[PDB]
Amino acid sequence: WQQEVVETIYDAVNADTDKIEARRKAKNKQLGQEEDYAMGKDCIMHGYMLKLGNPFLTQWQRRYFYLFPNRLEWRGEGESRQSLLTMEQIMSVEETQIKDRKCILLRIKGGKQFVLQCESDPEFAQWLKELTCTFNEAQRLLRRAPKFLN
Amino acid sequence: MRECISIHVGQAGVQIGNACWELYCLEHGIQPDGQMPSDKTIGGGDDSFNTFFSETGAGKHVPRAVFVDLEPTVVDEVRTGTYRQLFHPEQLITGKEDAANNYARGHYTIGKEIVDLVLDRIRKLADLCTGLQGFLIFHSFGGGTGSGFASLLMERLSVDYGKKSKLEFAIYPAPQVSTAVVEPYNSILTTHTTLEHSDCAFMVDNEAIYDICRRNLDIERPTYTNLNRLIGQIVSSITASLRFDGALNVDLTEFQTNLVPYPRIHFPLATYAPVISAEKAYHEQLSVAEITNACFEPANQMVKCDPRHGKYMACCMLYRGDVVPKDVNAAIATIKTKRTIQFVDWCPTGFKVGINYQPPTVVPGGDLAKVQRAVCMLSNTTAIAEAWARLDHKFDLMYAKRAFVHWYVGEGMEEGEFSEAREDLAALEKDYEEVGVDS
Amino acid sequence: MREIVHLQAGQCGNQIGAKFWEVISDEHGIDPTGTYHGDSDLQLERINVYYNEATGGKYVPRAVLVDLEPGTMDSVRSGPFGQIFRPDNFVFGQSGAGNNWAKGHYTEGAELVDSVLDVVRKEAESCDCLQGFQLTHSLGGGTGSGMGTLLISKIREEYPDRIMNTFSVVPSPKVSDTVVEPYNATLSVHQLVENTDETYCIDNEALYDICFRTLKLTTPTYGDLNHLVSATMSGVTTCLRFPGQLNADLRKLAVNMVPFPRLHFFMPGFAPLTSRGSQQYRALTVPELTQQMFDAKNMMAACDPRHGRYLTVAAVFRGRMSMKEVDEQMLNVQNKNSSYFVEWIPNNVKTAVCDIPPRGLKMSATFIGNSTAIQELFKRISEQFTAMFRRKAFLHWYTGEGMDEMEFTEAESNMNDLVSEYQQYQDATAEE
C-alpha cells in the first residue's frame, strides 16, 4: 500500500494535504483554549474524544478532554466552562467497544457514567494507556497514599 | 434438657432480645404478667416452655437472658415498658459511661470495670439450668458497646466453657449506607476475635432488609420494629425443633456440626422466606418448590452478594409448618439439576430435613400474615468474601493516613493490632479463595 | 447522676444565658415562681441535669453569673425569671472592665476569682458525677473574654476529664463594638486554641441579615438573637436532655467532629427560619429541611462555606419522621455535590434524630458542622492585628498595666501558624 502511494500520487497528495491543513487551520480558534488548558502539565493527556455521558447522550459527539492524576476535565469543542470530573470524583474506569467506536467508561460519585470515544486504534491505545495509568493509579492511589501528609 | 442462655449486648442486642421474648410469649400464650390468668377461656400454653422459660412453685415464668448495656438510656427505656413485670431488674445492669461506637474505651477502660458481676450472673443462670447446648449472643459491629464488651466477655466465656456451642449474631456495616463513620474501626478488631475465638458467626445487614421490605411488603416509611421482627422470626425458625418436635428434630448440635466445614470458614448465608405482607399472603398459592427456588435468588438474601460469583460448599436446610416430604424431595430433585446454581465439583449433595408440625404464628398489629409453612436455609458459599474485601479496602483507605487513630492511641492500645487484624483478614481471604478454587 | 454545670460571663453572655434559662423553663413547664407546672412525661426524669432537687419540688437553676459590673445583675434580676436564680452566684466586682482584656485579667481577675472558684467547686462537689461545663460569653469586652478564658483554664487544670464547650461571639469588621476588639480577639484566640476542648462561632451580623431577609421582622433586636441562640443551644442539648432512639452526647460529637485539636471550631444552625405570614403555609418534610441545612442562606456565619471543603458534618434532628430519608439524602448530596466536601474521607455526615419533639413546635432540626469558611475571618483578623500592631496604637493602655509586648508577638506567630495549617489542610489532596 505504501508502494501504491509512493509511485502513484504521493508528492501531489502531500501538496494537496498542505492545502487541506491550511484550509483547516485558517478557520477556527476556540479549540486553542481547550488545548492550551490541556497541553503538557500535570495533565497527563490532551486529546479529542467523541463523548457519551449518561443516557443523556447515547449518540457520539466529538469533544475535548483533560487527564490529570488528580482530576479529569472536559470541554465541548470550545465550551466556555472547563467541565470538571475529577479522578477524586470518579471511582471506576473500564474500556467499552461501542460499534467499533472504542471508548473508555468511568463511574463517578453522583451515579454518573461517562463514555469517551477517542477516534482510532492507535489514538485509543494512547488514551487508554494514559487512563490505565491515571485512574488505575487513582485506584492504586489507596496503596500509594500513606507517605505524604503526616 | 434443651435449654440455652441468650446474651444481649448494646441497644440493638437489647431490642432484638425484647422482640424475641415478646414473640415467644405471644406464640406460647405467655401473658405479660408472668402467670396464667386465662381461667375462663384457654388459648394454648400446654407445651414444653422449659427450653426458654422457667416454672416456679407458684406457676410463674422467669426469662433466662442477659440484658447488659453500658448506657442506661436503653435500660430505663425498656424498664418503663409494659413488660417490666416479666423479667427481673437484676438482669438489667446499667452503667455510668458507655462506648457509643468506640472499641478502646469499651474494651479497656469501660468494659473491664463490669466483669465480675456479669460473670456471677451468667454462672447463676447456668447453675439454674440443667442441660446447656449453646448461647445466643446478640450484639453489633457498629455499636461500641456491642463490640468491645462483647469481645472481652466472649473471650472469657470461651476459656470458661469449651464444650458449649458459641453462636454469634450482629449487624454488618453495609458498603453503601451506614450509620456511623468509625464502624470499620470496631469491625476490623471484632472480626479477629469472632474468628479466632468462636465456632460460628452469622452476618446480616439492613440495606437488604430495606430492599426486601420495599419490594415485597411495599412500605414507604420503614421502622426498626419490622427489622427486629424479621430477626426474631429467623431466630425462632432456627431454634424451632428445640421448643417443639417433629418428624425429624434438628437440634443446635445437629446442624452446627455440619454448618462448619473448616475452623476458618463459619459464615453462613441465612435466607428467611416467605417475607411477605398480608395482601401478599392471600392471592398467592404457596408450595415448597417455589419458595425453595426463591431462597436461592439474590434478591431475597439478607447479604448483598451475587451467589453466581462463587459456589456452595455446604448447605443447611430447615422448614417450619405443614410440609410434606414429597414436596421436599421434588424440590431437591429440581435444584440438584439446576445449571444456574453453582457448586463445588466435590460435594454432590448436602442439606437437612427439619419437619416442624407447629406452623408459625402471627402478631396482632404486625405485618406478617398467616402462612401455613415457613422455610429457612443456611448455605456456605465463597461469593460472600467480597464483603470482607470491601471492609479491608476501607480499612486500608482509612488507616493509610491514620484518620481518627490518635484517640485510640491516647486511650491506650497497641497500634500494631491494626496491622495484625489486617494481615489476619488477608489470610482469611486467601484461605477463602483457596477453598473456592476447584481442581 | 450525670449533670451539667452551666457558667456565665459577659453582659451579652448573661443576657443570652437568661434567655436560654427562660426558654427551657417555658419548654419544660416551670412557672416563674419556682415550682413545676409541666404536663409532659420526660420533663421529670432527666430534669435534674440543669436543676437541683430541693424540698417542695422547687427546682433551682445551676449557673454561676460572673461579671465585673453591678449594673448587669439588677437588669437580669428585674426580669420575669430573675427572682428564681441563686443570688449567691451573682459574683460582681466594683470596677468595670473598660473593654480591656489584660486589665480585667490582672486586676479584676486576681481578688475576685477566689469566690467563683469556691462556688463552682462547691457546686461540683454537691453532685455525684459530671460530664462538662458550659460557658456562654462574648469576645466583645473585658468581662466575658478577659475572665472566661481564665475560668476555663483553671477548671481544665483542676478537672482535666471534663467537656469544655463554649459559644463565644466572634467579632465582625462590618459590625463592631470595640476599638480594641482585634486586640482582645487575638488574645482570646490563643487561649481558645490552647486550653479549650471545643468552641462554636457566634455572629450577630449574620443573624441580623437572616432575620431581615427571611423572618422579615419589623424591629429585630437583641431579644430575637437571644431567642435564636437559646433555641440553638436547646437543640444541641436535646440529645442528652430528651433521650430518644439514637441519642448522643457532647463528648461523642467533640471526638467525632474534631479531626485535630488545633481546629475545634464549628458552625451551628437551625432549620425552620420562616416569616410570620408563611408559618401557616409550609410543607414539613425531609428534603426541605435538607435544603435549608445545606444552603448557606440559612447559615448564621458571616462568610461563605462554598469557598472551601466540608470537613465534619453532624445533622441532629428532633422529631418523629424516619431513618431512611436522612441517609438517602446525605448519600445523594455527597454524590452530586462532590466538590464541596473532603473526598479523602467519605461519609462526613452524622445522623441523629430525637424522637422527643420540642414544646410548641413539631419539626425541629439543628446543624453542627465544621466547614472551610472561617479561614476568611482568621486571615482578616490577622491582617487587622498585624496592621494594628505595626505603629503600636491603643497599646499604652496595655503597657501601663505592665503586661509586655511579646505576648502580641507570640499570639500573632500562633495565628499565622494556625492559618497556614488551615490553608494547607483546605486543599487536602488525594495523592501527589
Swiss-Prot record, chain A:
It comes from the Eukaryota. The keyword NADP does not apply. Ubiquitinated. Keywords: ATP-binding, Cell projection, Kinase, Nucleotide-binding, Serine/threonine-protein kinase, Synapse, Transferase, Ubl conjugation. It is found in: Postsynapse; Presynapse. GO terms for molecular function: ATP binding; beta-adrenergic receptor kinase activity; G protein-coupled receptor kinase activity. GO terms for biological process: receptor internalization; signal transduction. Residues 42-136 form the PH domain. GO terms for cellular component: cell projection; postsynapse; presynapse. Specifically phosphorylates the agonist-occupied form of the beta-adrenergic and closely related receptors. Belongs to the protein kinase superfamily. AGC Ser/Thr protein kinase family. GPRK subfamily. Interacts with GIT1. This is G protein-coupled receptor kinase 3. It comes from Mus musculus (Mouse). The lineage of its organism: Eukaryota, Metazoa, Chordata, Craniata, Vertebrata.
Swiss-Prot record, chain B:
The modification Phosphotyrosine is found at residue 432. The modification Phosphoserine is found at residues 48, 439. The modification N6-acetyllysine is found at residue 40. The active site is at residue 254. Transmembrane segments: none annotated. It holds the Pfam family Tubulin. Some glutamate residues at the C-terminus are polyglycylated, resulting in polyglycine chains on the gamma-carboxyl group. Glycylation is mainly limited to tubulin incorporated into axonemes (cilia and flagella) whereas glutamylation is prevalent in neuronal cells, centrioles, axonemes, and the mitotic spindle. Both modifications can coexist on the same protein on adjacent residues, and lowering polyglycylation levels increases polyglutamylation, and reciprocally. Cilia and flagella glycylation is required for their stability and maintenance. Flagella glycylation controls sperm motility. Some glutamate residues at the C-terminus are polyglutamylated, resulting in polyglutamate chains on the gamma-carboxyl group. Polyglutamylation plays a key role in microtubule severing by spastin (SPAST). SPAST preferentially recognizes and acts on microtubules decorated with short polyglutamate tails: severing activity by SPAST increases as the number of glutamates per tubulin rises from one to eight, but decreases beyond this glutamylation threshold. Glutamylation is also involved in cilia motility. GO terms for cellular component: ciliary basal body; cilium; cytoplasm; microtubule; sperm flagellum. It is an enzyme of class 3 (hydrolase). InterPro entries: Alpha_tubulin, Tub_FtsZ_C, Tubulin, Tubulin/FtsZ-like_C, Tubulin/FtsZ_2-layer-sand-dom, Tubulin/FtsZ_GTPase_sf, Tubulin_C, Tubulin_CS. Alpha-3 and alpha-7 are identical but coded by two different genes, they are testis-specific. The MREC motif may be critical for tubulin autoregulation. Belongs to the tubulin family. This is Tubulin alpha-3 chain. The gene is Tuba3a.
Swiss-Prot record, chain C:
GO terms for biological process: flagellated sperm motility; microtubule-based process. Keywords: Acetylation, Cell projection, Cilium, Cytoplasm, Cytoskeleton, Flagellum, GTP-binding, Isopeptide bond, Magnesium, Metal-binding, Microtubule, Nucleotide-binding, Phosphoprotein. CDD domains: beta_tubulin. A motif (MREI motif) lies at residues 1-4. Pfam families: Tubulin (PF00091), Tubulin_C (PF03953). GTP binds at residues 11, 69, 138, 142-144, 204, 226. Its cofactor is Mg(2+). PROSITE patterns: TUBULIN, TUBULIN_B_AUTOREG. The highly acidic C-terminal region may bind cations such as calcium. This is Tubulin beta-4B chain.
